[PDB]
Structure formats: C-alpha cells, structure tokens
Amino acid sequence: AGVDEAAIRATEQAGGEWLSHGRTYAEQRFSPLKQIDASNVRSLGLAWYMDLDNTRGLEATPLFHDGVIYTSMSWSRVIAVDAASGKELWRYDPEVAKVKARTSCCDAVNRGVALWGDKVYVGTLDGRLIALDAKTGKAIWSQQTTDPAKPYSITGAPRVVKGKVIIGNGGAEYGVRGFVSAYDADTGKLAWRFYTVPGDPALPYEHPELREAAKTWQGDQYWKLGGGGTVWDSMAYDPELDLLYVGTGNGSPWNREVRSPGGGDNLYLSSILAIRPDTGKLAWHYQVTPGDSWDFTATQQITLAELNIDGKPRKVLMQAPKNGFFYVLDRTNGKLISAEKFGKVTWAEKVDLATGRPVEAPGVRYEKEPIVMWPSPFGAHNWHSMSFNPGTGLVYIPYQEVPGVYRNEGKDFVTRKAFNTAAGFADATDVPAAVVSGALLAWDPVKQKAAWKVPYPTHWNGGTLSTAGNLVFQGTAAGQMHAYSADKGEALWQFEAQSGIVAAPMTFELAGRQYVAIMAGWGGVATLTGGESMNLPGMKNRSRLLVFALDGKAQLPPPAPAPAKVERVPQPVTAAPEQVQAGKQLYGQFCSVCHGMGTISGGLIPDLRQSSDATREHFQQIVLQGALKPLGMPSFDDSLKPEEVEQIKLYVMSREYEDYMARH
C-alpha cells in the first residue's frame, strides 16, 4: 500500500520524491529537479530547520514521500517530519543501550531508513532490523539479525528489493563474520543470507560459494577471529538484470599475516558481489582488494549507469572504494572495464587490466617493517556519498588524503575486548592537520581522469548531491553547505550551517517548490579518533535538519559563548618511562577509539586531559566500576586491572602536562 518497485523506478524520471537511500536503485543520487539551478542558486536560502535532541554524528540521507520526510538520528532513532508544517509527526526510539558503543566502531550513527508499502525500515546499533508503520511510527516487526553476544552493529541504511529488506552489519574492527541478509518486508521472516567469508570447517558451508571461497584462506584461526567482510553500507539494484549488488568490507583482523598467515585472496573480503535477489545465489563477484590487510573496504557507494566506452554503450557499475582506485565494471558479468587511481595511492602501482588484480608495491604488507602508505583506514573515499550526473557524465567524490601507518603485531598479537586490527592501529597518537587534506573531486569515469577539483583543508567532508540544474551540493567538515556548478566546479552558494557536515544532501519537490535538505551533525569515526586535524574551527556538533529553498528567509540563531573555564595548572608528573609507556599503549588499545588518539579528543566525547579533579579522583570508579555507565562510558573491569588503569591515568596526566607546557 504505497512504495513498491514501480514507484521507486518511476522516480528515475520524476524528481519530486526520493524513495530509497541513494535516491534511485542505481544509487546515482541525481535529482531531475531543476527549479534551483546554476543561474539562480545564489538566491538559495534557509527555508526552515528543526533542532534535534542529538549530540552525536548524523549520517542519514532523508527520504521524501507523499509530503513526509523520513530520517534518523544518533542511536538509531527514527523520526517522520511533515514537510509542509515542519512539525515532527512521530519518532521511534529503539532504546539502544548507550554502552553498546563499546562494540560500535564508528560513532552511534545511522545512515537512514528505507520505505516499502506503508512501512519504514531501520537497522539498529544493537543488531535489530525493525519495521515501523509509516503513518504512526508504531513497530510492526523486529528481527535480531545478529548474535547479541558478538560485537556486531548496524549503521547502514537498508534497501528494499522485490519485497525483501536487505541489510548487513558492521564490526570487523572487533572481529566478526560478515554477511548480508534479505528479510520479508511484511513479516520480517528471513528469506536468505549470504555470508561473505567462510566459517568453522567443522560445520557445513551455508551455501556453495563458501566452499570455493575457503580455498583462498589459510590456517585455523580466521573463523575464530571472525574473518571480516562486513556489509555495512552500500548496495545497488538493477531490476532489468535482476541483480542485487553488494559491497563487502575489510578482514578481521586487518592484518592478513595474523588473519590468514599462509596468505590467500581471502574471498569475499573487499569485494563487489552481484547476487540474485530472489535466492541469494551469487551471479558474479569482483574482488577489489585481494588479501586486504589495510582496512580497505569495498562497502563504498556502488553506482549503476550507462556509459559509452570506446564507442560502445555499456551497462556499468562504478565504485571509488577506500583503496584509492576508481572502478568501472560491466555490471552484467562483472568484467573489469577500467581501474585508475583517483588520488594519492602508493600501496599499489596499478590494477592489472588483464588479471584484474592490483600490482602491489614492495613491502606494503608490512611483514618485516612497518609501512607508511596511502590511502589509510580512513580511506581515499569512505561512506560519505558520491553522486553521478548523467548530464555532465561526472562522478562527484568526497576525496580524502590521509597517511596510513601499519605495523605487523604478528606473533605478539593478542585478541582483546576492543579493536583487534593486529596492525598497530593503537600506535597512532595524532592526525596532524599538516598531513591531511580533502577535496570535492569531479571524476570522469570514461576518461578515468579528474574534470575539476575543489580543495579542502582536511578530509571528512560530507556526501554530494547532483541535480539537473547543473549543480552539485555538499556540506563540509569546516561547517558550510555548498553549491557548485556541475560542469566546472565554480563556487555558487555558501551557507554557515553551525555544524560540521558528514551526511549527504537530498532534494525533493513539495507543492511545486524544490527543497534541498541536509542532516547537519558532525560525527563519524574520524571525530572520535580525533587528532589536531579534527579540531579545526567549525568541527563541532550542533545537530539540525536544515532545509533550503529559493529565497528562503530563515536564520539560525547565534550560539551562546561557552561558560568560563579556568584550565588547571598541571603539576609535573614524575614516573618511570616504562610506566608512562604502558599507559600510552593501554590507552591506545582501549580508550583512543572514543577519547581520541593521543588523548586528543574530537569534541563529541570528553577530553581526558581536561577532566576535573573530582573526576580524576574517581578514575578507578568510572573506568572499572562503571560509575558513568548510564551515560555510555563502559566499565572495563573485564579487560583491565586497577594498576593498568592507573598506568593509563598516568599517561593521560602526562599528556595534559606535556600539552600545557606547549603553550606558555
């Protein structure tokens, strides 16, 4: 009763609505709407906005259908907003335990919901796939898709194909076995499940593909460690070819030397899968990063399009994953058409067209010595949306340039109840502004070359939106909403959003008027690992749903200045070097993922260097006795001893004094 395949396909020509995550099943995030164009976007203004009781990352792409905006907020909460009145119609809160974040790698985020019939679908941080009544927001059915005992979580938006709700999950950083499932839209009954990596050999393979994949894995530890290959984000669908395309993630642990000692491609890690939606049977696959040992996922946006290659019309599938190569594949059979670097890439010389395999540079697998390379775990392109404009033939990518540093923990690797990369990710003590940069990259998929590029001081800028009005919209880490000419990248309109933006803009039509909406709420994993680059002006969270339209007259109020804060004058901290070092390591292994690398917090979670004296006195109570558990600060008594927590406190105070002396 409402949203069905015909309705979603129809939006391909009708720009009024946005019924699926990437707008259309092809996920081009291109709107035919052109009331707002390059000639008049200078007149664009804020039409209205909604303040949100949210203080964490907002990554959702809103959906618009029949006058209603459907979106989500941090902690997997869903809200329906009437686009005409601007009033919240209803909200659904799954009530995820705040401490669930201990096993949620990258901020308490949610990329959006899906629509089908008269229901709304959302995935939660604790592994649930829930169906809600579109009109009232009441829960219809709920499925616990993951083992509550394992470090799984759902952050991505589901898609609905032929009456089946498709959703994956995340957790490869902690160590889990990846998979994507299809649930019946009306009942929630599991239709089929495709695991992306093989499981315990002592048990049967769930499907034939796994038997073949198993031949590409070595050793007897990968299934105990999880294996990885989580499907936490992108997927596309072509109804004519009847193929569901899914992107799989990195391995668990990251380091193949520990994950699969003897080597191997480790299928289907970092791969693009073409699956039969009705059965879950694999039609074809393409492995983006064989033997992935760098957190190089292939879960980034998968866009379907029709391009003319060498004078011949081709049905392609495009992706610009973390590894830095831009892929153009024949979406009917998975044959590689082209693959070229779209930014700084030093881990591989190129992707061999004939074999389809990347030609790795010397020492990039860091077996004997640590390696500094590009891209990094943050990726040349992460989840921030890209978009395709059929008119210009260009793909607009939120490019990122950050150095990746990997160390082989090898025999010294120890599985912990925390991140298990086995690649020395814990060694990081900062993300310097000097070593990072970003850019709005207009990529030509046919020529495999940049058409134009707009530079940004840092990475972690928001997704893009393309429209028929020769425009591309994007929000930035620095706190602005932008509009550039699609063809040349000329800056046409800017707006101070009052919050760093990471989500993707979307547009729709209501009563003959075009609106552009964006979920403004600084967040995502980078804001948690922090570092200097993530503490520049504008990188603050002020969660709001912002809606723009021609001649919009709304104005955001000026924030109130922060109260007085007399920083404590740090007394010298004398301690044995090894003791401070022990604290440095323990902190990096267990606390950096939320409080920031080297204690340099990103602002969403407290800076341990600035804790009050009362807080410092209760350090043991907080860390080991869960005194702040109701606020989301986990208790680590299951992993750390009092003396170890003391070593961490010593390290923290050492950094506070170290930094305080920096100034003055």
Ligand X SMILES: O=C(O)c1cc(C(=O)O)c2c(n1)C(=O)C(=O)c1cc(C(=O)O)[nH]c1-2
* Residue 232 partner contact from ligand X, ligand HEC, Ca ion, none using kind-dependent CB cut-offs of 5 to 8 Å: ligand X
Residues of this chain that bind ligand HEC (CB under 6 A): 101-102, 590-591, 593-595, 605-606, 608, 611, 615, 619, 622-623, 628, 631-634, 636, 648
Binding site feature residues for pyrroloquinoline quinone: 59, 111, 155, 171-172, 230, 322, 382-383, 525
Separation between Cα atoms, residue 537 and residue 519, nearest integer Å: 19
443 touches 342 (CB < 8 A):
yes
Q: Three-state DSSP class for 259? A: helix
Please say which residue, 249 or 552, places its beta carbon nearer to ligand X: 249
Buried b (16+ CB within 10 A) or exposed e, 252-286: bbbbbbbbbeeebbbbbbbbbbbbebeebebbbbb
* Residue 383 partner contact from ligand HEC, ligand X, Ca ion, none using kind-dependent CB cut-offs of 5 to 8 Å: ligand X
Place of tokens 């919209």: 473
Q: How far is the CB of 334 from ligand HEC (least distance, A)?
A: 38
Q: Write down the catalytic residue from 265, 295, 487, 607.
A: 295
Q: Is 250 in the site for ligand X (CB under 6 A)?
A: yes
Q: How far is the CB of 72 from Ca ion (least distance, A)?
A: 21
Please say which residue, 518 or 593, places its beta carbon nearer to ligand HEC: 593
Q: Is 172 in the site for ligand X (CB under 6 A)?
A: yes
Among 27, 173, 238, 607, contact with ligand X (rule: CB under 6 A): 173
Among 170, 227, 280, 583, contact with ligand X (rule: CB under 6 A): 170
CA quadruple 21, 24, 29, 31: dihedral sign: negative
Q: Three-state DSSP class for 392? A: coil
155 touches 146 (CB < 8 A):
no
12 touches 55 (CB < 8 A):
no
Q: How far is the CB of 461 from ligand X (least distance, A)?
A: 12
Phi, psi of 102 (to 5 degrees): -65, -25
Q: Is 93 in the active site?
A: no
Binding site feature residues for heme c: 591, 594-595, 633
Q: How far is the CB of 428 from ligand HEC (least distance, A)?
A: 15
Q: Which residues contact 117 (CB under 8 A, 6 or more apart)?
A: 1, 2, 3, 4, 185, 186
Q: Three-state DSSP class for 516? A: strand
Q: How far is the CB of 153 from Ca ion (least distance, A)?
A: 12
* Residue 181 partner contact from ligand X, ligand HEC, Ca ion, none using kind-dependent CB cut-offs of 5 to 8 Å: none
Please report which residue ranges of 102-249 form alpha helices under DSSP H.
Answer: 208-214, 222-225
Q: How far is the CB of 551 from ligand X (least distance, A)?
A: 34
Q: Is 301 in the site for ligand X (CB under 6 A)?
A: no
- Give the Å distances, CA to CA, from 99 to 53, 62, 629, 630, 633: 19, 27, 7, 8, 6
Please say which residue, 135 or 616, places its beta carbon nearer to ligand HEC: 616
Q: Is 110 in the site for ligand X (CB under 6 A)?
A: no
Burial of 186 (0-12, 13-18, 19+ CB in 10 A): middle
Please say which residue, 68 or 525, places its beta carbon nearer to ligand X: 525
Q: Is 271 in the site for ligand X (CB under 6 A)?
A: no
The DSSP line for 541-601 is ---EEEEEEET----PPPPPPP-------PPP----HHHHHHHHHHHHHHTHHHH-GGG--
* Residue 248 partner contact from ligand X, Ca ion, ligand HEC, none using kind-dependent CB cut-offs of 5 to 8 Å: none
* Residue 390 partner contact from ligand X, Ca ion, ligand HEC, none using kind-dependent CB cut-offs of 5 to 8 Å: none
The DSSP line for 52-95 is -S--S------EEETTEEEEEEGGGEEEEEETTT--EEEEE---
554 touches 49 (CB < 8 A):
yes
Please say which residue, 250 or 589, places its beta carbon nearer to Ca ion: 250
Please say which residue, 27 or 644, places its beta carbon nearer to ligand HEC: 644
Q: How far is the CB of 341 from ligand HEC (least distance, A)?
A: 35
Separation between Cα atoms, residue 149 and residue 153, nearest integer Å: 11
Q: Tokens representing 24? A: 């259309």
3-state helix, strand, coil in the chain (%, to 5): 15, 30, 50
DSSP state of 413: -
Which residues face 182 on adjacent strands? 166, 192
Please say which residue, 83 or 288, places its beta carbon nearer to ligand X: 288
Q: 244-283 mask for Ca ion (x: CB under 5 A)?
A: ------x---------------------------------
Half-sphere exposure of 462 (CA within 13 A, CB side): 37
Please say which residue, 27 or 59, places its beta carbon nearer to ligand X: 59
Separation between Cα atoms, residue 278 and residue 268, nearest integer Å: 20
Q: Is 227 in the site for ligand X (CB under 6 A)?
A: no
Q: How far is the CB of 173 from ligand HEC (least distance, A)?
A: 12
Among 22, 137, 151, 171, contact with ligand X (rule: CB under 6 A): 171
- Which stretch in 62-70, 169-177, 327-335, 483-491 sits in contact with ligand X by CB under 6 A? 169-177
Among 71, 103, 287, 382, contact with ligand X (rule: CB under 6 A): 382
Q: 151-180 mask for Ca ion (x: CB under 5 A)?
A: ---------------------x--------
Among 17, 37, 107, 265, contact with ligand X (rule: CB under 6 A): 107
Q: Which residues contact 77 (CB under 8 A, 6 or more apart)?
A: 91, 92, 93, 94, 110
Interacting residue ranges for ligand X, rule: CB under 6 A: 59, 105-107, 109, 155, 170-173, 230, 232, 249-250, 295, 297, 382-383, 524-525
Residues with catalytic function: 295
> Residues interacting with Ca ion, by CB under 5 A?
172, 250
